[PDB]
Design a protein around this ligand. Structure first.
Ligand SMILES: Nc1ncnc2c1ncn2[C@@H]1O[C@H](CSCC[C@H](N)C(=O)O)[C@@H](O)[C@H]1O
Ligand code: NA
Lengths: 265, 265
């Protein structure tokens, strides 16, 4: 009787750790969710085949309201696994599920996996220099979210980089692109006018991290806002003050304008 | 003609991803480095046996000064792997190595794996709330670095959590403990009197992330400064004001005293 939270990784079924695979392979029951993120390089079948077990997919409602009614009961007499994209506890509310397991008398274990949060390192931006992170949510009705704009502002004042997770509506299959995120930010800039996000703002786009050929691009908003970065998922990053080597990488690897080599210390 | 930056993960030889293991097995040459960090839950022999390839270990100088003389030449006419603990390119100097590869006419690909930056999610702290990260270094001679202290001050000033990497003498396999880190911080507090780190400060200690039996402890400095958190490596975190959900996890999963539910929320 035990519950394993197992991350599947960034892009395909092979992004799971060897540890996670060995353990999943020997679990009696296997559950999973695919609404917290998008694994653009695989399918449920490829995952099932790799693990050699049938996988029951749960919706956000199944988890958020019935985790203790669907999964925990089984973990009382067997070994159960709960799979998720990336790392199980990053930019999700899955950590609270460990409390539910406790209160149900079920020991739980976490098997980590590559997360978009650390894969940002491939942009060449020093990961220790990232500050508060934010999520850009699709506007709904007359409710128009803007908190992520202040996050960028606060970080930028401190010279820190900002990681912006992009919205995802799995059931509708809506995956916010870096372009849509850029458009939303420009609209918030007009509203607040704090000189935080403009056509001249340098940004970095990372698409489909985890694949062997992700899209890594850096440039000014005015030039990237209409560029095609391939299929989702995408993340947007607003760098803070750049180090010479960060800029060198952006130019050499992310194709940024050579003029950013000239940093303003 | 191809260089693969492959991550080994967090603790043992099973923390490498399936994608990384298979790709390393198809490589003609395999290098590794264990100066940026160490795999406390395994050995070079076990990693070697798992990959089924002889592994040549490179020192900090081998990499930083002669990467293009030791690794790249072979990468010109072969598939070469460069293994590193955690997720590739997280260590601040590693990204630049891709520029050297390009400059050498060598194609490079990054194969991700779990990093402590994302793994700390198991502490129950929301990942978006982490601010700038720092490293606590051992003082030596007339040198007593304290900038990591200011990092905590600025993060906590904004309700942000601070991730503190602890010093390590990889060569001498000497791990700074969470306890030593706290003593150092108290000392710095005594010298800067900024009211940033005191006996009443709440902290979180994460030891052996990646293991099935990691140590997750949360509490006040005065009660944890002499507690035994087990074998290294240790990671220290100074949380900013907590979200009730975070506090509940620290209490239920990390054994934090109920006092944080009213004092740190
Ligand atoms: N491979 C990938 N490439 C680019 N962005 C990604 C990504 N995987 C996740 N994301 C980003 O993160 C959002 C999901 S947030 C959930 C993240 C997950 N637990 C992890 O550890 O990575 C997506 O909407 C997207 O903006
Ligand atoms: Na961070």
């Amino acid at each position: 009787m035990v519950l394993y939270f197992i991350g599947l990784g960034l892009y395909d079924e092979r992004d799971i750790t060897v540890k996670g695979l060995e353990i999943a392979k020997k679990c009696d029951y296997v559950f999973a969710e695919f609404y917290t993120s998008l694994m653009a390089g695989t399918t449920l079948g490829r995952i099932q085949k790799l693990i050699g077990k049938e996988i029951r997919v749960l919706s956000r409602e199944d988890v958020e309201l019935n985790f203790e009614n669907i999964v925990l009961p089984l973990a009382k007499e067997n070994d159960v696994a709960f799979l998720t994209p990336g790392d199980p506890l990053v930019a999700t509310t899955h950590a609270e599920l460990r409390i539910r397991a406790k209160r149900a008398g079920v020991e739980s274990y976490v098997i980590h996996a590559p997360s978009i949060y650390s894969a940002v390192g491939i942009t060449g931006l020093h990961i220790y220099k990232f500050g508060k992170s934010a999520m850009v949510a699709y506007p709904e009705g007359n409710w128009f979210p803007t908190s992520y704009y202040d996050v960028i502002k606060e970080n930028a004042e401190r010279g820190l980089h900002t990681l912006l997770f992009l919205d995802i509506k799995a059931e509708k299959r809506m995956y916010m692109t870096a372009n849509e995120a850029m458009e939303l930010l420009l609209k918030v800039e007009d509203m607040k006018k704090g000189g935080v996000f403009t056509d001249d703002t340098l940004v970095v786009v990372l698409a489909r991290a985890g694949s062997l050929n992700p899209t890594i691009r850096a440039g000014y908003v005015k030039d990237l806002i209409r560029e095609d970065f391939g299929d989702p998922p995408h993340i947007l990053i607003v760098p803070g003050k750049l180090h010479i080597v960060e800029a060198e990488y952006l130019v050499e690897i992310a194709g940024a304008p050579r003029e950013i080599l000239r940093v303003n210390v």
